Write a protein that binds this ligand. Structure first.
Ligand code: CLA
Ligand code: CLA
Ligand code: CLA
Ligand code: CLA
Ligand code: CLA
Ligand code: CLA
Ligand code: HEM
Ligand SMILES: CC1=C(/C=C/C(C)=C\C=C\C(C)=C\C=C\C=C(C)\C=C\C=C(C)\C=C\C2=C(C)C(=O)CCC2(C)C)C(C)(C)C[C@H](O)C1
Ligand SMILES: CC1=C(/C=C/C(C)=C/C=C/C(C)=C/C=C/C=C(C)/C=C/C=C(C)/C=C/C2=C(C)C(=O)CCC2(C)C)C(C)(C)CCC1
Ligand SMILES: CC1=C(/C=C/C(C)=C/C=C/C(C)=C/C=C/C=C(C)/C=C/C=C(C)/C=C/C2=C(C)CCCC2(C)C)C(C)(C)CCC1
Ligand SMILES: CC1=C(/C=C/C(C)=C/C=C/C(C)=C/C=C/C=C(C)/C=C/C=C(C)/C=C/C2=C(C)CCCC2(C)C)C(C)(C)CCC1
Ligand code: SF4
Ligand code: SF4
Lengths: 28, 40, 31, 44, 139, 143, 80
């Protein structure tokens, strides 16, 4: 349903963008 | 707040970014840069 | 007649280019 | 009504903790370990 | 290392801070013939012992102010005060007096550094030494 | 008799002994705080500190905030507390990044880059926990 | 640190040395004046630029000049 249709994309995207945000700092 | 101009949703997100997100990010980066020791 | 929202979005997309050019110029001037 | 309140509460619990979970996952030695990606020190 | 016998003082809040044990501190030692009262440059008055005394301060100016007070504000004057710089690693550098003779009087063995051989009115013009990273006095 | 003397036996330091600077009750109460306790991991220190500091922040917006009149009152307080704790964690992380980026020691595990980062993460999660438990206590029904 | 320079107009009057509170100046032997002594600044790294030495100088304009430059912990007179 619409609930899954939105959450299946939303719930990993925030995780991934937080990951990339941290990688933007982990670089020496 | 809302208006009758086209794309009325643009201020809703643009103004908070230019008011909170952008200043927070630039002050954070500037604070990090001005404090990096060495390489004078 | 008033502008269309597509015009506003296109204006933002166009304004993306001077932002990138300004970033490049500032980084060049930093050297 | 109360439904919007619960919607806001549910969307406030999860988003920050998810972002911070991602930040913690890649900040510690977990991203390299799980995915097999080598850390820059080991490179030869 | 150094001597001891600190002056009898009740302490104050105007003394040392973190820098003392992180960057440097200063020590001043002197021998007094009587157990008397002097004025601490950090606020308040303290009793200095009869014999040798050692005092730790945070700035060289404070040590030299106490030295001035010792030299001038006592009828039996004090001329043997010594000022050292105490590094956080325990290394102690003897600062004042440099050669043991007071700087106010001429003495042999000095190098005469910092002296220009010209008048202050004969300094080079700023424009002529442009793009040299030096001001007119530096040349 | 004299309740005021030198600070920890050295008068020449810039401090004085007071019934609140080195009293037994003062040292006992301070030494047992989460930021100063013994044998506590930095992550758990941060969790404990953040729990309280986010619990108490729920107050002012609920009673004085712009939404205090409406039913969206405790929610407004919760949102304000969450935003404040988020900005607090960002500031903590920035301080940790800029402070201990030089030489690293393990004499104090809080005063090191990894220790401070763990402190910040635990502080974040504790802030969320405390703010949410405060909201659950204050907010009526909604269950 | 600040730079303290002594020019050839000094008369060996020693006022500058006594006026200095941080022990930067010194009296050295010389021949260009009647007093046969001149001022030197061996410890300029301890000078705070308080300009007391210049205020004590009696010669026309100043035989001793102080130019303020890079500020360190010593030259800023910090106790913390
Ligand atoms: C320098 C020119 C300028 C200025 C002062 C403003 C000012 C404003 N714009 Mg605007 N805008 C501009 C150019 C400008 N605009 C241009 C060229 C575009 C086309 C892309 C837009 C598109 C635009 C939209 C779509 C919206 C605004 C909005 C706003 C208002 C919200 C605050 C803001 O700027 O953030 C938002 C504005 C932006 C993110 C625009 C990007 C900045 C432009 C493109 C370049 C500015 C560069 C500038 C020279 C940098 C100088 C640095 C200096 C301070 C040191 C504010 C009155 C909002 C509004 O009206 O709310 C009611 C809104 O929704 N602007
Ligand atoms: C830069 C632009 C900017 C923007 C867009 C806002 C926006 C806002 N401010 Mg504000 N503020 C700003 C700058 C800004 N501020 C500055 C520079 C100061 C310093 C003087 C303040 C000081 C200030 C105070 C003291 C307060 C606000 C509050 C608010 C909120 C009131 C709206 C409402 O109905 O509350 C309810 C709004 C919501 C429930 C939506 C929350 C949305 C996000 C998730 C909140 C984070 C609103 C989100 C009030 C507040 O905290 O309200 C919560 C409040 O008490 N502002
Ligand atoms: C004002 C200071 C203060 C505050 C706000 C807290 C707050 C808290 N402590 Mg705590 N604690 C304190 C001082 C404080 N502590 C001191 C001085 C000691 C040393 C004796 C402890 C020893 C201690 C232990 C051993 C435990 C807590 C726990 C807790 C949490 C559970 C809440 C609870 O039991 O009800 C309110 C209680 C208090 C306000 C106290 C809570 C966040 C528990 C915890 O972390 O739960 C997982 C737990 O097991 N505390
Ligand atoms: C809005 C401000 C505010 C408030 C209300 C609190 C509240 C709290 N903090 Mg907190 N904190 C704050 C800002 C604040 N914090 C800031 C800005 C920082 C950054 C440095 C911290 C860092 C911090 C740490 C690191 C810790 C706390 C802790 C605590 C809790 C225990 C109280 C405490 O620290 O002992 C009270 C405060 C002190 C003992 C500090 C000295 C305060 C002065 C000197 C008191 C003067 C004495 C005087 C004689 C008293 C009588 C005066 C008058 C009544 C006559 C409590 C929930 C502790 C905790 O986790 O608890 C669970 C803890 O370990 N805080
Ligand atoms: C602007 C300042 C301000 C404001 C408006 C509030 C407002 C509030 N606080 Mg509060 N608080 C503040 C500062 C503030 N706080 C500070 C500085 C501290 C110390 C760090 C606390 C510590 C604190 C605790 C420990 C508790 C509150 C609680 C509360 C709520 C209940 C009112 C009350 O006193 O309990 C009245 C009594 C009850 C509601 C009975 C509940 C049991 C209320 C929304 C309570 C809460 O949210 O739980 C319900 C609570 O337990 N506050
Ligand atoms: C000190 C001055 C002051 C005070 C007390 C207030 C008070 C208030 N303002 Mg306001 N404001 C001020 C100056 C002030 N304002 C200024 C200068 C501006 C800009 C010109 C604004 C702009 C502004 C806006 C735009 C809005 C407010 C709003 C509010 C209300 C709720 C939001 C709030 O502040 O709580 C939120 C909570 C905090 C800001 C943080 C709480 C800080 C805690 C309580 C400190 C406690 C310290 C602790 C006790 C130390 C002891 C610890 C010990 C026990 C261990 C509240 C009545 C909002 C409103 O409409 O409400 C009616 C709103 O929308 N203000
Ligand atoms: C365990 C995690 C989550 C749960 C259980 C959850 C639950 C829900 C529920 C019950 C709804 C229905 C309310 C509504 O549609 O108005 C909803 C809607 C929504 N959720 Fe989540 N949520 C979670 C996480 C997230 C996250 C992290 C995002 C990030 C963007 C997200 C995005 C959305 C969006 C955009 C909607 C609106 C749907 C619509 O308008 O059709 N969700 N969520
Ligand atoms: C008690 C204590 C200590 C002593 C503290 C004392 C005596 C006083 C402290 C007072 C303090 C820290 C007050 C703090 C006030 C904070 C305020 C007023 C914050 C306001 C925030 C607002 C209104 C935010 C608004 C917004 C948010 C949250 C956003 O994210 C963006 C939007 C917006 C701007 C609206 C010390 C000794 C410092 C440490 C010890 O551990 C604990
Ligand atoms: C992707 C995409 C979309 C959205 C696009 C969006 C959202 C675009 C946003 C654009 C923005 C936000 C543009 C911002 C522009 C900023 C500019 C042009 C800044 C210029 C600065 C200049 C010229 C000079 C600065 C300076 C110089 C030179 C220095 O040396 C130092 C001082 C300083 C002043 C800094 C949508 C979905 C619609 C459609 C699909 C494609
Ligand atoms: C980009 C752009 C631009 C620019 C902009 C800028 C540059 C901005 C800045 C920004 C900024 C500048 C920001 C700021 C912010 C801030 C904040 C956000 C703050 C907050 C605060 C608060 C929150 C407060 C609180 C308080 C206190 C502290 C005390 C008293 C009380 C009260 C509560 C009030 C322009 C215009 C050209 C336009 C185009 C684009
Ligand atoms: C521990 C703790 C805490 C604390 C925290 C912290 C410690 C914080 C910090 C914070 C910080 C530490 C922050 C910082 C900030 C910064 C800033 C805000 C900056 C700004 C900037 C600017 C202003 C800029 C300027 C400029 C420059 C510099 C150059 C160019 C130009 C310009 C102008 C741009 C809390 C309370 C939470 C709680 C409890 C625990
Ligand atoms: S005060 Fe002037 S004239 Fe006298 S000794 Fe010093 S530099 Fe020479
Ligand atoms: S400026 Fe002050 S500290 Fe420097 S030499 Fe002159 S009197 Fe001494």
């Amino acid at each position: 349903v619409r609930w899954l249709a939105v959450h299946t994309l939303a719930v990993p995207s925030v995780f991934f963008v937080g990951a990339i945000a941290a990688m933007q700092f982990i670089q020496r | 707040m809302d208006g009758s101009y086209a794309a009325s949703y643009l201020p809703w997100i643009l103004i908070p970014m230019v008011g909170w997100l952008f200043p927070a990010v630039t002050m954070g980066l500037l604070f990090i840069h001005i404090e990096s020791e060495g390489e004078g | 007649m008033a502008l269309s929202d597509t015009q506003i979005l296109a204006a933002l997309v166009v304004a993306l280019l001077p932002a990138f050019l300004a970033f490049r110029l500032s980084t060049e001037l930093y050297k | 009504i109360v439904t919007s309140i619960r919607y806001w509460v549910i969307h406030s619990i999860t988003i920050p903790m998810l972002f911070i979970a991602g930040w913690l996952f890649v900040s510690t030695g977990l991203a390299y370990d799980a995915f097999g990606t080598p850390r820059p020190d080991e490179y030869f | 290392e150094l001597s001891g016998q600190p002056p009898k003082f009740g302490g104050s809040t105007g003394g040392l801070l973190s820098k003392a044990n992180r960057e440097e501190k200063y020590a001043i030692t002197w021998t007094s013939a009587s157990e008397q009262v002097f004025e601490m440059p950090t606020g308040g008055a303290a009793i200095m012992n009869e014999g040798e005394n050692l005092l730790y301060l945070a700035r060289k100016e404070q040590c030299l102010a106490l030295g001035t007070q010792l030299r001038t504000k006592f009828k039996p004057k004090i001329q043997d005060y010594k000022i050292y710089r105490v590094y956080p690693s325990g290394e102690v550098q003897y600062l004042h007096p440099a050669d043991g003779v007071f700087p106010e009087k001429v003495n042999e063995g000095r190098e005469a550094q910092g002296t220009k051989t010209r008048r202050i009115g004969q300094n080079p013009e700023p424009v002529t030494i442009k793009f040299s990273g030096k001001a007119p006095y530096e040349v | 008799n004299q309740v005021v003397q030198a600070y920890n036996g050295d008068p020449f330091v810039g401090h004085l002994s007071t019934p609140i600077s080195d009293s037994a009750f003062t040292r006992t109460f301070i030494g047992n705080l989460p930021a100063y306790r013994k044998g506590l991991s930095p992550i758990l220190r941060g969790l404990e500190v953040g729990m309280a500091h986010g619990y108490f922040l729920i107050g002012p917006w609920t009673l004085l905030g712009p939404l205090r009149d409406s039913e969206y009152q405790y929610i407004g307080g919760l949102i304000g507390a969450l935003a404040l704790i988020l900005v607090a964690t960002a500031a903590l992380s920035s301080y940790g990044l800029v402070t201990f980026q030089g030489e690293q020691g393990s004499g104090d595990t809080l005063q090191t880059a990894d220790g401070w980062s763990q402190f910040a993460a635990g502080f974040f999660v504790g802030g969320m926990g405390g703010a949410f438990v405060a909201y659950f206590l204050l907010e009526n029904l909604s269950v | 640190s600040h730079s303290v320079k002594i020019y050839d107009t000094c008369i060996g009057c020693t006022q500058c040395v006594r006026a200095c509170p941080l022990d930067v100046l010194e009296m050295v032997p010389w021949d260009g004046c009647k007093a046969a002594q001149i001022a030197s600044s061996p410890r300029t790294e301890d000078c705070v630029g308080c300009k007391r030495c210049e205020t004590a100088c009696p010669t026309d304009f100043l035989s001793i000049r102080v130019y303020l430059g890079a500020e360190t912990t010593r030259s800023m007179g910090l106790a913390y």
